[PDB]
Structure 1
Amino acid sequence: MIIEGDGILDKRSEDAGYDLLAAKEIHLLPGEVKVIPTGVKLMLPKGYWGLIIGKSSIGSKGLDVLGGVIDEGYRGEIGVIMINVSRKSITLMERQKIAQLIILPCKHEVLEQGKVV
């Protein structure tokens, strides 16, 4: 797939997702929510969406990833919504690994109003 930017890294065939980098330094006080920029854009392949999910190293620090659904038609820059849900302050350095992008399949169904048994 075509991407733009160096905020996303190539993975091995045995890894589920691509590491995403922080485009700039970010400081987060306990309970603070910030949308961290990555500087990358992508043209997800037709029939798939992208899931942003956390990495064990940052997660074990009390940081969580909110939202996380990259739609196939999105062309904007990818942003990672992060909250410090721990009780201590944390600083993420520029170009630090903050999350992962996993490509998964799309299933489009038509909504039929009926009565579920």
Structure 2
Amino acid sequence: HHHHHHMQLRFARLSEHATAPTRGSARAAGYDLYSAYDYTIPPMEKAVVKTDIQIALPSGCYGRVAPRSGLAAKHFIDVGAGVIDEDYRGNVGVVLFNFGKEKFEVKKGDRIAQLICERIFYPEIEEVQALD
């Protein structure tokens, strides 16, 4: 009506240990997420990796925490969970799975995942007697 602009991905640092999310190119699907702490993930184990940022997602999307391709193919790393709700205001955590035979070293400042703004519907739910 009166105002004409573009929605932004907003973030705030929760400590000095966080790194501002970055995008490699203009058409990259996601923003890089960086670990704020050191982690040693043993073989066949999981860790909750803290970024020490909180985000406010633009309306009409959720934030999907998605795997970095290189880490999957080379080190058998996968990302668990990964659904960041539009109204989530806490510390953004990344659930890393280490399926490899060797321990996996995460250092503060390492890129460990990517954040994609996935467009979704928020539909109302209706029970019917039967479907067709």
Give the TM-score taking structure 2 as reference length.
0.83
Cross-structure match for 1:93: 107
5+ long unaligned stretches in structure 1: none
- Residue-by-residue CA offset, 1:21-74 (whole Å, 9 max, x unaligned): 011111011111110000111111111110000001211211110000000001
Q: Which has the higher contact order (CA 8 A, sep 6+)?
A: 1
5+ long unaligned stretches in structure 2: 1-8
Say which of 80, 88, 113 aligns to 1:74. 88
| RMSD of aligned Cα (Å) | 1.2
Kindly indicate whether residue 93 of structure 2 is the aligned counterpart of residue 107 of structure 1. no
Structure ID, larger Rg: 2
Task: Letter of the 1:42 partner, please give it.
Answer: I
Cross-structure match for 1:34: 47
Task: Letter of the 2:46 partner, please give it.
Answer: V
Identity of paired residues, percent? 29
Q: After TM superposition, which residue ranges in structure 1, 4 or more long, deviate above 6 angstroms? A: none
Kindly indicate whether residue 22 of structure 2 is the aligned counterpart of residue 10 of structure 1. yes
Cross-structure match for 1:116: 131
Asked if the contact 1:8–1:18 (Cα under 8 Å) also holds between the matched residues in 2, the reply is no
Aligned residues: 117
Give the TM-score taking structure 1 as reference length.
0.93
